[PDB]
Amino acid sequence: LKTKEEHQKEVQYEILQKTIPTFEPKESILKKLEDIKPEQVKKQTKLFRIFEPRQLPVYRANGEKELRNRWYWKLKRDTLPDGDYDVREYFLNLYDQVLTEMPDYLLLKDMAVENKNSRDAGKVVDSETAAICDAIFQDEETEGVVRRFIAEMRQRVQADRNVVNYPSILHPIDHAFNEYFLQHQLVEPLNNDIIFNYIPERIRNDVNYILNMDRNLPSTARYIRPNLLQDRLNLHDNFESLWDTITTSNYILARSVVPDLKELVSTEAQIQKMSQDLQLEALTIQSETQFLTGINSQAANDCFKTLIAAMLSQRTMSLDFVTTNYMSLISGMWLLTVVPNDMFIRESLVACQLAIINTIIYPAFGMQRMHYRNGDPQTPFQIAEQQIQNFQVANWLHFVNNNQFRQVVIDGVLNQVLNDNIRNGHVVNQLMEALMQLSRQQFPTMPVDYKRSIQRGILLLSNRLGQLVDLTRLLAYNYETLMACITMNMQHVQTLTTEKLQLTSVTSLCMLIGNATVIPSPQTLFHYYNVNVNFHSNYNERINDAVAIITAANRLNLYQKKMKSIVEDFLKRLQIFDISRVPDDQMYRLRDRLRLLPVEIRRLDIFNLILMNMEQIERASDKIAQGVIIAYRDMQLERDEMYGYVNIARNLDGFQQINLEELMRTGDYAQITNMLLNNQPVALVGALPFITDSSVISLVAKLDATVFAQIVKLRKVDTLKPILYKINSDSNDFYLVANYDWVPTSTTKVYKQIPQQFDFRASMHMLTSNLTFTVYSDLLAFVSADTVEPINAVAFDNMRIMNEL
Amino acid sequence: NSRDAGKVVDSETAAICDAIFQDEETEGVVRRFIAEMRQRVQADRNVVN
Numbered sequence: 001l002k003t004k005e006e007h008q009k010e011v012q013y014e015i016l017q018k019t020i021p022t023f024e025p026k027e028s029i030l031k032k033l034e035d036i037k038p039e040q041v042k043k044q045t046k047l048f049r050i051f052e053p054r055q056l057p058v059y060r061a062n063g064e065k066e067l068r069n070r071w072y073w074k075l076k077r078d079t080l081p082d083g084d085y086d087v088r089e090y091f092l093n094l095y096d097q098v099l100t101e102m103p104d105y106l107l108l109k110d111m112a113v114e115n116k117n118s119r120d121a122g123k124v125v126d127s128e129t130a131a132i133c134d135a136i137f138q139d140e141e142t143e144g145v146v147r148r149f150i151a152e153m154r155q156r157v158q159a160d161r162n163v164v165n166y167p168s169i170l171h172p173i174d175h176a177f178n179e180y181f182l183q184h185q186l187v188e189p190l191n192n193d194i195i196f197n198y199i200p201e202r203i204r205n206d207v208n209y210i211l212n213m214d215r216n217l218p219s220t221a222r223y224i225r226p227n228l229l230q231d232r233l234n235l236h237d238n239f240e241s242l243w244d245t246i247t248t249s250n251y252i253l254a255r256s257v258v259p260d261l262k263e264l265v266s267t268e269a270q271i272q273k274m275s276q277d278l279q280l281e282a283l284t285i286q287s288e289t290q291f292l293t294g295i296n297s298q299a300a301n302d303c304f305k306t307l308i309a310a311m312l313s314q315r316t317m318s319l320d321f322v323t324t325n326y327m328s329l330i331s332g333m334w335l336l337t338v339v340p341n342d343m344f345i346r347e348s349l350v351a352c353q354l355a356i357i358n359t360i361i362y363p364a365f366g367m368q369r370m371h372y373r374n375g376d377p378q379t380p381f382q383i384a385e386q387q388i389q390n391f392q393v394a395n396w397l398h399f400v401n402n403n404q405f406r407q408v409v410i411d412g413v414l415n416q417v418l419n420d421n422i423r424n425g426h427v428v429n430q431l432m433e434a435l436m437q438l439s440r441q442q443f444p445t446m447p448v449d450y451k452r453s454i455q456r457g458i459l460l461l462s463n464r465l466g467q468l469v470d471l472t473r474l475l476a477y478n479y480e481t482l483m484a485c486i487t488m489n490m491q492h493v494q495t496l497t498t499e500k501l502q503l504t505s506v507t508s509l510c511m512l513i514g515n516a517t518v519i520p521s522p523q524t525l526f527h528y529y530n531v532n533v534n535f536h537s538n539y540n541e542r543i544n545d546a547v548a549i550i551t552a553a554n555r556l557n558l559y560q561k562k563m564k565s566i567v568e569d570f571l572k573r574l575q576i577f578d579i580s581r582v583p584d585d586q587m588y589r590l591r592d593r594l595r596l597l598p599v600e601i602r603r604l605d606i607f608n609l610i611l612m613n614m615e616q617i618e619r620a621s622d623k624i625a626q627g628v629i630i631a632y633r634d635m636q637l638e639r640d641e642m643y644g645y646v647n648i649a650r651n652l653d654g655f656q657q658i659n660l661e662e663l664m665r666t667g668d669y670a671q672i673t674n675m676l677l678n679n680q681p682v683a684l685v686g687a688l689p690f691i692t693d694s695s696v697i698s699l700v701a702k703l704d705a706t707v708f709a710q711i712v713k714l715r716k717v718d719t720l721k722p723i724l725y726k727i728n729s730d731s732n733d734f735y736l737v738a739n740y741d742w743v744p745t746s747t748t749k750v751y752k753q754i755p756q757q758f759d760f761r762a763s764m765h766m767l768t769s770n771l772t773f774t775v776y777s778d779l780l781a782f783v784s785a786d787t788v789e790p791i792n793a794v795a796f797d798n799m800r801i802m803n804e805l
Numbered sequence: 806n807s808r809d810a811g812k813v814v815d816s817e818t819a820a821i822c823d824a825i826f827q828d829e830e831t832e833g834v835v836r837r838f839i840a841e842m843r844q845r846v847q848a849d850r851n852v853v854n
Contacts, residue, residue: 238849559808559809560808560809560810562810585848585851588846588848589848589849592848592849665807665808665840666808666833666836666837666840667806667826667833667836667837667839667840668833668834668836668837669833670832670833670834715829
């Protein structure tokens with residue numbers, strides 16, 4: 001029965017543990033909270049570009065190679081996939097390629113090379129901009145104004161005004177990227193009034209923390225403001241399992257900040273009268289050496305970390321206690337008074353409050369044992385507040401019922417703060433006035449062995465009145481100066497798993513404490529701030545990176561992309577959760593709540609910069625064409641300036657549209673078959689990778705029509721390649737166009753757009769930014785903080801804590 | 806083969822969804838109907854269709 005009841009538990013507790021995303025060693029989350037680096041500030045070095053100017057040959061009418069050679073704006077790294085859906089998938093990857101490349105602060109003096117042909121000492125913004133400020137100067141084609149001007153463009157440096165501006169040559173799409181990163185930097189100027197407002201309000205207005213600023217900050221210092229707003233996902237109402245690690249990791253982060261107790265009373269000094277006052281051997285009790293087991297000095301520290309860190313982060317605490325051991329139960333009366341009773345889990349708060357009543361308080365006054373159904377909306381201290389007939393143990397039970405966390409909102413966040421009566425210790429006078437009277441009472445039927453052994457076990461706690469009023473003045477000051485060191489919101493909900501607090505070890509706190517107070521060191525207190533900023537700034541800068549993909553996947557009409565993938569790596573960047581344990585009803589609430597949020601003010605404007613220019617990148621790219629227009633009739637080739645004779649179309653007008661993406665997903669080739677067996681004109685529309693031929697005999701033999709018949713025999717349409725005739729003097733067999741009297745004719749043309757010409761006056765424009773920054777990433781490394789000597793440490797009222805010295 | 810890469814309910818069901826799709830003599834109305842065949846999920850009341 002010993003190894004079956006404890007093996008039936010761990011096969012049923014582990015079904016509940018395999019839905020909580022906490023890591024399996026508890027203490028290993030303390031590394032993953034401090035390992036969160038604050039930000040990665042990025043400064044770019046090369047100016048962001050898409051289009052570079054190339055030289056392409058030019059042909060006139062009656063197409064021949066021309067001596068002059070004219071620039072064009074053909075884009076570099078043109079890797080455009082075929083198909084309509086894979087192009088829009090490529091433009092979602094470019095949107096990730098920019099939001100990584102997006103620089104925070106942008107200097108412009110660093111990217112500045114000499115203009116090698118300028119008479120005055122002029123500078124331009126790039127090596128790759130000065131490379132095309134040179135080729136304009138050397139060409140015979142450029143006008144005598146631009147040859148004169150490009151040697152006279154001059155930058156302006158103003159080091160006193162801290163502004164600088166250099167000339168540049170950029171594509172108009174390339175300008176709106178390099179102008180957006182240059183106008184909206186994330187740097188704000190920093191003074192001594194920002195560092196003094198960065199410290200929390202309580203530890204700046206605290207008397208026993210002297211702060212001083214011993215470093216000068218120049219007029220050119222900037223900093224990055226952390227994106228610090230309360231959780232726009234309400235992760236406490238419906239996420240019962242995803243909140244149980246945010247309340248676990250914040251419990252183990254706050255367990256390493258509360259200080260260690262010092263100068264305790266000796267272990268073998270206090271037990272040698274606790275075994276004399278209780279008189280354990282002379283009783284007829286079954287557990288003789290099991291009263292004083294958990295009274296160690298290493299468990300006095302354990303009920304001081306647990307009692308604050310499960311109070312600082314909102315982690316509900318179940319109690320563990322044996323009801324035969326009344327010395328843990330009398331010391332349990334102090335636990336319910338100071339710690340607010342809505343912190344404990346209700347089914348164990350009831351079982352502790354009933355166990356105090358049913359064998360200490362109600363056998364004292366002689367009244368009957370307390371029968372109590374568990375589905376009762378009144379806790380047993382709420383029922384014995386009216387059926388008891390003292391005033392001292394009724395005005396104590398009026399406090400254990402009516403203490404809870406009184407919600408206040410200070411300094412922008414909501415933190416559950418205690419009341420003014422526990423926080424200065426004055427409640428425990430009302431405890432030990434209700435505890436002394438309960439030691440005088442004749443327990444009218446209890447045996448005389450067990451009556452004086454329990455009236456003396458009360459006088460072991462009621463005689464420590466000066467040092468229980470000096471514990472809760474300290475226990476609610478370590479909580480008070482750390483609660484102001486919390487940037488996230490402090491929501492209180494009943495958690496799913498409870499961090500167990502043993503009453504056998506809270507007895508080792510009430511009667512093992514001395515009058516030596518402990519105060520958090522200000523370098524520990526600043527370290528606990530720089531985690532709860534760095535976790536809260538990272539939690540809000542990964543929602544903004546996950547929202548700006550989910551909406552960018554929907555504005556692009558990009559289906560077939562699983563939104564469970566974008567959510568599960570949002571939880572991977574958050575360094576606490578693991579993905580293999582989150583259930584499917586909470587990664588589907590989370591992909592629902594991440595759709596309703598608005599996109600951030602900067603990640604939306606970059607997406608609107610690639611959404612309006614999604615046409616001009618796809619149109620200017622070679623190796624793909626935007627659909628073939630089949631007409632099944634004789635129409636002549638259009639003379640073109642960079643193609644000679646070519647079958648090109650500029651508009652899909654007068655012809656039926658058919659969408660190749662809708663023809664691929666549905667698999668319904670019932671119309672495109674019937675439009676090809678019958679010779680009816682149909683303009684196909686999509687993203688088609690075309691081929692090029694330079695022979696006239698392949699135009700006379702009409703190879704343009706033989707490529708669409710594979711759609712009928714083979715139902716797949718990925719294998720489709722329209723043709724583009726290119727007839728120039730460099731083409732072999734060109735003499736059939738020149739010598740004979742005929743007009744070249746193709747039955748189908750293709751839809752393709754000519755790349756843009758290079759125009760200098762619409763491509764030259766100044767870029768203006770600052771000259772010198774000094775970006776600081778640590779702001780609480782500037783305040784030189786000292787604590788006071790801890791003997792002279794005061795509470796919120798100016799009397800000192802631990803006033804027994 | 807669907808518009809959205811969704812889940813049908815059984816491996817025998819998708820074994821006679823693609824065998825209908827990849828077959829030639831299946832009319833394109835049935836072939837279009839396999840494409841518009843995916844799951845629907847609701848998270849607030851946890852049901853799936």
